[PDB]
Amino acid sequence: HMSDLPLRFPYGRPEFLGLSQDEVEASADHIARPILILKETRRLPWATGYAEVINAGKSTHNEDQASCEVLTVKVSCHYWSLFDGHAGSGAAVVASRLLQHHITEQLQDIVDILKIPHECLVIGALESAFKEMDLQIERERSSYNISGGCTALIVICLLGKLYVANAGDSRAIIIRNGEIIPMSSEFTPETERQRLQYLAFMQPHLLGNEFTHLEFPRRVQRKELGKKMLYRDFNMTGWAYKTIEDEDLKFPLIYGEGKKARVMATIGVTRGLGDHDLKVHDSNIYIKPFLSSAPEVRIYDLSKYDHGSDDVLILATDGLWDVLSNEEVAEAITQFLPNCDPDDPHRYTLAAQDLVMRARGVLKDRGWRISNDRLGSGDDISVYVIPLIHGNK
Amino acid sequence: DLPLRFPYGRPEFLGLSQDEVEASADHIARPILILKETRRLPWATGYAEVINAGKSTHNEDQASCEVLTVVSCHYWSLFDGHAGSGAAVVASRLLQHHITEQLQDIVDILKKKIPHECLVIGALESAFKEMDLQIERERSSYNISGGCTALIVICLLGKLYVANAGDSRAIIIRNGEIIPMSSEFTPETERQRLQYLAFMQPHLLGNEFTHLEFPRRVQRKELGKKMLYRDFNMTGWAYKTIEDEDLKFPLIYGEGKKARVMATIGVTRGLGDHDLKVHDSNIYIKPFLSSAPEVRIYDLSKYDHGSDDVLILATDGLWDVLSNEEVAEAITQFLPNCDPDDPHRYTLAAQDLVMRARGVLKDRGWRISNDRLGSGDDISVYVIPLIHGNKL
Ligand SMILES: [Mg+2]
Ligand SMILES: [Mg+2]
Ligand SMILES: [Mn+2]
Ligand SMILES: [Mn+2]
Ligand SMILES: [Mn+2]
Ligand SMILES: [Mn+2]
Ligand SMILES: [Mn+2]
Ligand SMILES: [Mn+2]
C-alpha cells in the first residue's frame, strides 16, 4: 500500500551541505566513496564540523541523514541530529526535517517556566517530541511512502546545558582534555534483553506461537528434549538449569551476541522511528510492539567547566563506532586538533573528515582496509565535531 | 486458623531461651540484643538488634547466619517482615536450603561462554523465586503471615555475592570509602517497571487506579486543565489535559520514603504478600511485587583488607534515620578504639550503630543526635569484617 503513495520529502543529503542535485549524485559513488565535508563558504552554528561518506555498496542511497540549526522557542535552542535509516531512506529523511519542529512545539509548552527542576521539563519535552514524531509517521504512513525506519540521536543546547537524546545505536561522546565522557548508550537486543523478554511474557500473543521469550546459551535442539540446559528469563541476570520442554524448542526471542544479537531473527537495534509495518521473515508477526521511540536523555552542564578549543562533542552513526573504539576516536581527535590554528574555523570540519577517513580506510585488493590491516567500515558514516568552547558561560 | 509453619523466635545464633525472647520484646525499654561474646559467628561477624517502639507486638525482623555445605559457603541473611512475622520466619530457615540446592546444580562447573559468576548469580535468583513459590503453596496449609524483604550475602570461592529484594541495604566501608553493594526497590525506584505492567495489563488496576504519575493528587478542580504528568516511557515531565480517568488514584503516589504502589505498600520486592489486597477491595497487590533480587559481586582477592574494612548489612530501621556517611563516620570512629585482635570488636560496632539509630526516650519521643527523631522500627545490623576474607 505504501509503495503506491508519493514520497513525503524528496531524497537528498543534509541541507546544510548545500549540494546541487548533480553533486548529490557525484557523492553516491560506492567505489570512490568521496568524503563530503562542509564547504568553508558555509558555516554551521558554533563552527560545528561535519563529514560523511556513503556505504561501500549495500544500499544505492546513503541512508544516514543529519540536521543542524538554531531553533527559536516562542529563547534560542541549538540543535544537532543524526538519523541512521534502514530498509529505506524515508523515515530518516522525514525525521531530519520534522523532529526539530516537534521539539520546538514541546519546548513552547514550558518556555515561560524555563524563564520539578526545569531540566526535567526539558527532558520531558524531548521524550514527548520523539513520541509525537513517531505518531506522525504512523498516521501519515497512509498518505505518503515513508519507507523503513531510523535511529535518532539528537542534542540541543538550551540555557547553558547540552541534552543528548538517543533512540538507537549511534553514539555521542565528549572529549575534554583527552578524557572520554560518554553521553549516550546503545539500544540493542542485548542491552534491552530484559525489557523485551518481559513484554513477551506479559503479552504472549506478540510471539505468534513462533518464539519463546527464554534465552539459551545456544540453539536448543529437539534431541535435547527432556534434558537439562542453562536458560535465562526476564527477571534473571545469570543462568540456571531447566528441563527442556517442547515450548523451549521454539526459536528464541533473543539470539546472537554483540553486533549479531537479534530480536525475533530480524533486527539488531531496538529503538528509533518508523518500522511500523515491519514483520518477521516469512510470517505475519509484527516487530514494532518490541520497538520504542522513547529516547534516553543525558545532560552535560557546560557551566561547570572551562572548555578549551580542543574540547569537543562527537556525534556519529555506527558506521564510525563499528570499527573505531572510543579510545581510537579520542586519540585521533587529540592528535589532529593541535595541528590546526585555534582560530581556524574550518578546523573542526577537518577533524570530522579525519575521523571518517580513519573509519573508511583505503580500498585494497580484498576490500576497504584501515590501520593494522583491519577491515574498514563499509557502512554510511556521518560525524559531527561540536566545539564545546562555544558553550562557555 | 492454620498451624504455624515455624514457631516465632529470634535469630538462633543469639542463643536465646524462650524466657529471654519474651523479655527482649519490651516496646518501652527497647533493649539492644547483641551476640554473646561466648558465641562466635563466621568471620567473627558482629550482630545487634532491637525491637520496634510499638507498631507490632513482635519484632518482625529476622536473621540467619551459617556455613553451608555445597564446597563450603558462608551465608548471612536479613529479612524485614511486615503485616506479620510468618514470612520473615519461614525465609530465615528455608532460603538457605533453596540456595544450597541451586548451588548444587552447578558446583561441579565451579571446580556463548558463561562466566562462573553468572552461574552463582542465576542460582541465587532461582533460590529467591523458589522460596516464594514454596510460601505460595504452603500458604494454604500453614499460617505464614504477611510478607518480608530479603537481603542475603554468600562468600563462595573468594567472592562475595550480595543479593537484595527489598529496601534493606548493604554497604562496604574500606579505608574510609563507602562502597554501595545494593539498591532499594520502592515504588519510586521501580516506577517505570510498575507503570509498564499496569499499561500492558490494565485489568490489574481493577478500575480504581490510573498508571500515570502526577506531581500531586489530581483533584476535581483540575479537570480539563493543564497539569504535569509522567508515563512509563518518560524520565521527565510533560503537560497534559486532565481527563476523568486522571482523577483515579495513581498507581504510584508520594516520593522518597513516602512513595507507595496502589495506595498500600512502600516496598516492591520481597517474599510473601500473596493475598495482600487494596483496602476494602478485591484488587491484588502481588502482581506488582517481585521476588527477583539484584546481585552484586565483590572480589575479595583484589584488595588486602585491614581490620577496620567492613561490610554493613542492616534493615531500613537503621537507614531510615542514618545516612551512609553517618554510618561510615560512626564505624571509622568506633573501631580505632578496639584492639584488632578482639573478636568482640564488630559486635560492639554493630551495637553502636543500633544505639545511634534508636536513641534515648524521654518525654518527646525517641531522640538521636542533634535532637533528631530516633527510629521506632525494628533494627538489625551485621558488621562483617573483610579482613577474614583475604586471600591465602
Ligand atoms: Mg542450628
Ligand atoms: Mg581474626
Ligand atoms: Mn543505515
Ligand atoms: Mn548498528
Ligand atoms: Mn549504520
Ligand atoms: Mn518490618
Ligand atoms: Mn522501608
Ligand atoms: Mn523495617
Numbering used by the authors:
A (entry chain A): 31 to 104, 142 to 182, 235 to 512
B (entry chain B): 34 to 103, 142 to 182, 233 to 513
What did the original publication write about this model?
Recent work has shown that the metal‐dependent protein phosphatase PPM1H counteracts LRRK2 by dephosphorylating Rabs. The crystal structure of PPM1H reveals a structurally conserved phosphatase fold that strikingly has evolved a 110‐residue flap domain adjacent to the active site. Cellular assays, crosslinking and 3‐D modelling suggest that the flap domain encodes the docking motif for phosphorylated Rabs. Therefore, PPM1H has acquired a Rab‐specific interaction domain within a conserved phosphatase fold.
